[PDB]
């Protein structure tokens, strides 16, 4: 949540405020406004980097609605005329009143600042050596864990290909059994009126030989049911392996994305604090 309570000085400093963020690109402002609700807003330095354009990215209807305020004769406002002086009292006036004054379509007035120092609350150890060691161990843990997640995704793809080709092989066995059963039914239809006549004329050696090589058909279907069984047990345990590998990447993905979020916020902290890559690049360049 937002505590606000900046103070009694309404026309306060532009550079340090809950609304302000400075010269930030679209990627990280899209990261900030994601998973937000109505009335969530943010004001940054504009994409043109001109003198005081200072666009706004209020959230409404699931879209980062990109309001731009003007810089006419040193004043600010959503659109002409610019009857309001300062941006802080502008956003406070839209915190007090609706947006129906300038345009009718907008309904939400304002609900939630995205403060620059809300994330700064959870961070500590302002001294350089502590955050240096913390960033080093965060980076090596992130590298090892990203290698583990890449291995997990490779295993997931390999098991998906294995289970897909085994599923196709099982379907091929199913089609083979269907063809063999249809052939068996057809030959029963032909042979229900064939064997007993050659019995009636009195000879059985040909019948026992054709019965022997007919039993070869039932023998063959007997081992191919065995092969389909050994491939279907294989399919079931490989599906279980696929499920547990998906469970492992289920466990590995979310702490990975929040660790990446913390790494990004630490990069932002180093950027705003002013120290660039001086000694951290020496370890990674080895």
């Amino acid at each position: 949540t937002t505590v606000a309570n900046n103070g009694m000085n309404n026309n306060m400093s532009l550079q340090d405020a809950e609304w302000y963020w400075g010269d930030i690109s679209r990627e990280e402002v899209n990261e900030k406004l994601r998973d937000t609700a109505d009335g969530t807003f943010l004001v940054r330095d504009a994409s043109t980097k001109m003198h005081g354009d200072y666009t706004l990215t209020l959230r409404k209807g699931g879209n980062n609605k990109l309001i731009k305020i003007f810089h006419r004769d040193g004043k600010y406002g959503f659109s002409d005329p610019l009857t309001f002086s300062s941006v802080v009292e502008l956003i406070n006036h839209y915190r007090n009143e609706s947006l129906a004054q300038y345009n009718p379509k907008l309904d939400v007035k304002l609900l939630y600042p995205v403060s620059k120092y809300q994330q700064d609350q959870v961070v500590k150890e302002d001294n350089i050596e502590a955050v240096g060691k913390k960033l080093h161990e965060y980076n090596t843990q992130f590298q090892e864990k990203s290698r583990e997640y890449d291995r997990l995704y490779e295993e997931y793809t390999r098991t998906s290909q294995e289970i897909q080709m085994k599923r196709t092989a099982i379907e091929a066995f199913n089609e083979t059994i269907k063809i063999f059963e249809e052939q068996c039914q057809t030959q029963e239809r032909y042979s229900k009126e064939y064997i007993e006549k050659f019995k009636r004329e009195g000879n059985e050696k040909e019948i026992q030989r054709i019965m022997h090589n007919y039993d070869k058909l039932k023998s063959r279907i007997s081992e191919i049911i065995d092969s389909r069984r050994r491939l279907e047990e294989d399919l079931k345990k490989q599906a279980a392996e696929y499920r547990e590998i998906d469970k492992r990447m289920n466990s590995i993905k979310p702490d990975l994305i929040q660790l990446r979020k913390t790494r990004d916020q630490y990069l932002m902290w180093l950027t705003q604090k002013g120290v660039r890559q001086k000694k951290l690049n020496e370890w990674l360049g080895n």
């Binding site: 690109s25 309001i67 379509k105 997931y156 063809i179 057809t186 032909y190 054709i210 469970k247 979310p254």
Partner: protein
């Protein structure tokens, strides 16, 4: 060679026969029937005419093997079993269908057995396009079939570039005609003289009147209809009545300064060379879709209610109960990537019992749904234990069209399978994924229940929208807004558009008919979750003037899913886009085919019609969609398109299948080269491949097949001595094939091909495509920064082909050559040694210009660390980058640092490379190249935005394209971008 194959005779008795590996069906069937007659119960047996073999392939489908000529190894049988049964079907349809299935890798009867009615309606309606294409193919047979089988390679420019118009002797091209006219195939030279303005009719007339020298009206006319121009060594034929400056062979000869190599082959010989193609209607076309559901109803604009969707349960979420506590099915009503309303979430049920039964209501009302509404189910779960802060992570995603092919709202309880999460997906839903259930069954499935009206509700025809357009209006400019509109028009597609400007755009629409460029911004300035706005915009689009194709393709990527908008864009494409730049942009249109919510629409009709009327376009279309059978998200749609193309492409099928099976067999080689061979210094390090290609069954499968990188190039006898492997990236294949035709010595006696496995050659194709459009821009604006986009083609999952340009060497190559036979002057000295003399400085000029081609390129595209091995220079002084791969950001600056050796070579070997006279000329042409790219960067944003749903692990959404947006500096002005590049090219030497 000794396979014991068992056969199911239709009398019933069981026979087993030995079979050879190379034996065909006729070779084995004769002794099969012989020893079947020898074996007892020879009563129902008769001749082989009415008996047909049936077996199940390794792709798990029974299919009759009517074609008796096929070998045993071509059968691809999972088990050595055959069956003997009556035909009970058609001959030609079944050989055609099996060949189609071999060209896809999966048979047509898979399409037969799938019960999705949209698939079969697509299969019915594609034959309309096929029959129209083959009717226009033979409307002027065999003349039109000549342009089909061998396509002209012309551009859309009747004129010529100005800086190459001065490269000739006052607009005149010296060619050589290598016509034989000899029973003893004697070759000879006719060096001959043409301008550039005339069509090949005057060229063949001049060749007739100059051929008749040294042995001297109607004769010229009858030889005109009996002779034709052919490029030597490669199968391009000059056919159509075109001004001959557009043929790419002639323009490439102007580029490189080489004289063109042509001949006069007989027209009737070419006509007899191409076989007559046949097109037969399918068996499923017998069924007519005239349904009479004895049970027209009301439309969307009479039913007033809210969108209520009830979630019942998931089948089984694939989670772990130990570390994950609760799950939820946060949904979203998307229009591409734009949420049409708020993301309504479900309850936070535990993962033990994934049952919801929640009637999620949505802010959108029923009449205000757009045509391309896309529900986005997503199983994502809170897997973080924090105070008043929930950590969210996607697990399963799945998109659903709210309207079907019938163009009606979905209703009734229905289950649907969910796709797994993509690699590194930032968003919790998936805006860009296609609509449809997962074909695999062992993935989590979830149940939905729409607002069951106990009826069907139909989105109306455009008459209702047209009347509502006149209704809603009832419910001369200040030029500042006009120049504001002009300013909006020049903005890139990823421009930061504001609702001040969006409301300005929507409030002034009938005044936007003056400029056509403003349309895609007007796409983003309308609320798709509206009733009047969509009707107004449809009324505008119906009366909207046509668009240049470069930004008419803007309406095609994932942000513009509207069927009417995409239909207008496709209409503008077929009205304006030409064949050469269709084949240029073919990869992008192939990837746009994913973004279609349906199967049958106008884009697929247009791309099929252009593919079935052009061998080059159709061939590259087939290979581009064949490369993505491993992508199961669009495997069905693209497989249907391979089925349609292979139905209506003609005899190229055979050639196609040959190269396909060649590639497939070659792919198989890399499997043994990768899975079995993963070590070093054994007895079979190189001898194994020599012995394996010494096998006749493998080498005969690589004979006489056309090159997959170019249908004009044809591949013949393999040279096992000149085939080897490398150890550069992941051990690819060096393949050498002699060009079969006799006149091959003019261009190249041998074709070299890299066959690469281990890396995805799909982003490399995109990079080389970018290189080719920057070539086009620089040639059009008057700067010959000759940089070569060598041909590359992905042919499946992590498999690709690269055509080799010869007389090239790495920096590592020349460095080790100098060391054996290191210093920072070896490249310039080597270029002295290759081509000295009066041409040398010109080569240096080329080496400057190609440098000015690549460095700027490698900054704009953001290619990775260009070291000394992933770059090669030619003998004529031209460099090029090969291992592109990681492009744009790909690791989250300073790409392709200008090395010292460049500073020697461009500066003529001077010791003080910093302020030589040619260096500021280099910088000036770099500036001009960047500016010429910069007013054409909207096309580049379009072309990269039409690649988001492709599936590279380094281009997903609007998180990567900001890299080219910030290197191209669309936010900045021209001068700020200039000083940006003086900054980077001043720190290129870290001070210079």
């Amino acid at each position: 060679p000794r396979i014991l194959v068992e056969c199911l005779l239709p009398n019933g008795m069981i026979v087993t026969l030995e079979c050879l590996r190379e034996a065909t069906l006729i070779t084995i069937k004769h002794e099969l029937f012989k020893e079947a007659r020898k074996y007892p119960l020879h009563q129902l047996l008769q001749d082989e005419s009415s008996y047909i073999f049936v077996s199940v392939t390794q792709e798990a489908e029974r299919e009759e093997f009517f074609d008796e000529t096929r070998r045993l190894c071509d059968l691809r049988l999972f088990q050595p079993f055959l069956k003997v049964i009556e035909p009970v079907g058609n001959r030609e349809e079944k050989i055609l269908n099996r060949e189609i299935g071999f060209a896809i890798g999966m048979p047509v009867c898979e399409f037969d057995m799938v019960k999705d009615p949209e698939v079969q309606d697509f299969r019915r309606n594609i034959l309309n396009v096929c029959k129209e294409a083959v009717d226009l193919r033979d409307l002027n047979s065999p003349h039109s079939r000549a342009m089909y089988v061998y396509p002209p390679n012309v551009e859309s420019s009747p004129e010529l570039p100005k800086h190459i118009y001065n490269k000739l002797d006052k607009g005149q091209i010296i060619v050589v005609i290598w016509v034989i006219v000899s029973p003893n195939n004697d070759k000879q030279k006719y060096t001959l003289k043409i301008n550039h303005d005339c069509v090949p009719e005057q060229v063949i007339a001049e060749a007739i009147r100059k051929k008749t020298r040294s042995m001297l009206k109607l004769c010229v006319l009858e030889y005109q209809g009996k002779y034709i121009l052919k490029v030597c060594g490669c199968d391009e034929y000059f056919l159509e009545k075109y001004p001959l400056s557009q043929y790419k062979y002639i323009r490439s000869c102007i580029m490189l300064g080489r004289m063109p190599n042509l001949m006069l082959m007989a027209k009737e010989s070419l006509y007899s060379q191409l076989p007559m193609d046949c097109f037969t209607m399918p068996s499923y076309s017998r069924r007519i879709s005239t349904a009479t559901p004895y049970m027209s109803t009301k439309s969307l604009w009479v039913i007033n209610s809210a969108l209520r969707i009830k979630i019942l349960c998931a089948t089984y979420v694939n989670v772990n109960i130990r570390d994950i506590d609760k799950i939820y099915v946060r949904t979203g009503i998307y229009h591409g990537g734009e949420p049409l309303c708020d993301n309504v979430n479900t309850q936070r049920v535990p993962c033990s019992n994934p049952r919801w039964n929640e009637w999620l209501n949505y802010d959108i009302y029923i009449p205000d749904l757009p045509r391309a509404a896309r529900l986005c189910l997503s199983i994502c779960s809170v897997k973080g234990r924090k105070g008043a802060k929930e950590e969210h992570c996607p697990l399963a995603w799945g998109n659903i069209n709210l309207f079907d092919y019938t163009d009606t709202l979905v209703s009734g309880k229905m289950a649907l399978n969910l796709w797994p999460v993509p690699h590194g997906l930032e968003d919790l839903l998936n805006p860009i994924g296609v609509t449809g259930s997962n074909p695999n069954k062992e993935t989590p499935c979830l149940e939905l229940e729409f607002d069951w009206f106990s009826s069907v509700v139909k989105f109306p025809d455009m008459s209702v929208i047209e009347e509502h357009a006149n209704w809603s209006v009832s419910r001369e400019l200040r030029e500042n807004d006009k120049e504001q509109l002009k300013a909006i028009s020049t903005r890139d597609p990823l421009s930061e558009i504001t609702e001040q400007e969006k409301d300005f755009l929507w409030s002034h629409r009938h005044y936007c008919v003056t400029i056509p460029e403003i349309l895609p911004k007007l796409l983003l300035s309308v609320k798709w979750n509206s009733r009047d706005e969509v009707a107004q915009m449809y009324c505008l689009v119906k009366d909207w003037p046509p668009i240049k194709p470069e930004q008419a393709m803007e309406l095609l990527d994932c942000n513009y899913p509207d069927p009417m908008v995409r239909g207008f864009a496709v209409r503008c494409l077929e009205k304006y886009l030409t064949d050469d730049k269709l084949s240029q942009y073919l990869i992008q249109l192939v990837q746009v085919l994913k973004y279609e919510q349906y199967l049958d629409n106008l884009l697929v009709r247009f791309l099929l019609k252009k593919a079935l009327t052009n061998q080059r376009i159709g061939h590259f279309f087939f290979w581009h969609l064949k490369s993505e059978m491993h992508n199961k998200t669009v495997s069905q749609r693209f497989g249907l398109l391979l089925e349609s193309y292979c139905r209506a492409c003609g005899m190229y099928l055979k050639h196609l299948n040959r190269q396909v099976e060649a590639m497939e067999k070659l792919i198989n080689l890399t499997d043994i080269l990768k899975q079995e061979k993963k070590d070093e210094t054994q007895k079979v390090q190189m001898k194994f491949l020599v012995e394996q290609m010494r096998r006749p069954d493998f080498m005969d499968a690589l004979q006489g097949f056309l090159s997959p990188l170019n249908p004009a190039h044809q591949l013949g006898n393999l040279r096992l001595e000149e085939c080897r492997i490398m150890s550069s990236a992941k051990r690819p294949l060096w393949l050498n094939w002699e060009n079969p035709d006799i006149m091959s010595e003019l261009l190249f006696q041998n074709n070299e091909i890299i066959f690469k496995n281990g890396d995805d050659l799909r982003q490399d194709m995109l990079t080389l495509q970018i290189i080719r459009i920057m070539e086009n821009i620089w040639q059009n604006q008057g700067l010959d920064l000759r940089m070569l986009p060598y041909g590359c083609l992905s042919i499946g999952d992590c498999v690709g082909l690269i055509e080799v340009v010869r007389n090239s060497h790495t920096i590592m190559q020349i460095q080790c050559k100098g060391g054996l036979k290191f210093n920072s002057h070896t490249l310039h000295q080597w270029l002295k040694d290759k081509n000295k003399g009066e041409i040398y400085d010109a080569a240096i000029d080329l080496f400057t210009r190609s440098c000015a081609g690549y460095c700027v390129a490698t900054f704009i595209l953001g290619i990775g660390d260009r070291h000394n091995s992933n770059i090669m220079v030619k003998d004529d002084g031209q460099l090029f980058h090969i291992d592109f791969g990681h492009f744009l950001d790909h690791k989250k600056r300073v790409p392709f640092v200008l090395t010292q050796d460049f500073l020697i070579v461009i500066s003529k070997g001077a010791q003080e490379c910093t302020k030589t006279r040619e260096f500021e000329r280099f910088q000036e042409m770099c500036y001009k190249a960047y500016l010429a790219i910069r007013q054409h960067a909207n096309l580049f944003i379009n072309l990269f935005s039409m690649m988001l749903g492709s599936g590279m692990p380094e281009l997903q959404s609007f998180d990567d394209i900001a890299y080219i947006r910030k290197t191209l500096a669309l936010d900045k002005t021209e001068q700020e971008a200039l000083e940006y590049f003086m900054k980077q090219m001043n720190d290129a030497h870290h001070g210079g």
